[PDB]
Amino acid sequence: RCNGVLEGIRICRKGFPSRVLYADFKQRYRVLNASAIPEGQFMDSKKASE
Amino acid sequence: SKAAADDFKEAFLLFDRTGDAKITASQVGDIARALGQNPTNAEINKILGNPSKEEMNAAAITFEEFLPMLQAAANNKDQGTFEDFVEGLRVFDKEGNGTVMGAELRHVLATLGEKMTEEEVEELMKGQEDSNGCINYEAFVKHIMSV
């Protein structure tokens, strides 16, 4: 609390709390539109998730 | 209503392979589309189940159930607006010209939502996409609404 950690989380959550790292994003969710999400993730680690 | 269109009954005799005047429940989706109705496959699925009708076990039909199911699907034809079909694909690719890159439309039509086979996706792009790899969806959606 006194760190600022809990306040950074607050401000985030007002904001955009959860933030996924791209690969961490690919792997876990490729399966959703499997063909088109896998291609995206593989083709550009970032551009993929996009 | 008849306008009693008796050609719906004549088309049921062209889709029944046994000639007994019954059409299985698995053919009813594609025959509603061949009579000039586009209900989504989840809608055709729901209605069926809604009526405690299982498309998992053997099915038969009678004209007396297929006629009112086509008349219940016929009210939903007001959902077929071409403004939203061309604007969907206009938000799918940059710049001021209606062109989808080939593989973008093929992978989206096979894997997003109601799965279309890649055989049917190739049969719907055949002729409208040339060797530049760019599908002009102004003429593509025009020809898709010509059938």
From Swiss-Prot, chain A:
Part of the intact protein present: 697 to 746 of 1939
Quaternary data: Muscle myosin is a hexameric protein that consists of 2 heavy chain subunits (MHC), 2 alkali light chain subunits (MLC) and 2 regulatory light chain subunits (MLC-2).
Cellular compartment(s): Cytoplasm, Myofibril
The name this protein goes by in its record: Myosin heavy chain, skeletal muscle, adult
Lineage: Eukaryota, Metazoa, Chordata, Craniata, Vertebrata
Protein task: Muscle contraction. Myosin is a protein that binds to F-actin and has ATPase activity that is activated by F-actin.
Family: Belongs to the TRAFAC class myosin-kinesin ATPase superfamily. Myosin family.
Domain notes per entry: The rodlike tail sequence is highly repetitive, showing cycles of a 28-residue repeat pattern composed of 4 heptapeptides, characteristic for alpha-helical coiled coils.
Protein origin, superkingdom: Eukaryota
From Swiss-Prot, chain B:
Residue ranges occupied by any EF-hand domain in the UniProt entry: 7-38, 41-76, 80-115, 115-147
Gene3D superfamilies: EF-hand
Name of the protein: Myosin light chain 3, skeletal muscle isoform
Modifications made to the protein after synthesis: The N-terminus is blocked.
Domain of life: Eukaryota
Entries under SUPFAM superfamilies matching the protein: EF-hand
Keyword Repeat set for record: yes
SMART domains given in the database record: EFh
GO cellular component, one term: myosin II complex
UniProt organism field: Gallus gallus
Quaternary state and interactors: Myosin is a hexamer of 2 heavy chains and 4 light chains.
Coiled coil: none
InterPro entries per the UniProt record, alphabetical: CALM/Myosin/TropC-like, EF-hand-dom_pair, EF_hand_dom
One MF annotation (Gene Ontology) recorded for this entry: calcium ion binding
Keywords per UniProt: Motor protein, Muscle protein, Myosin, Repeat
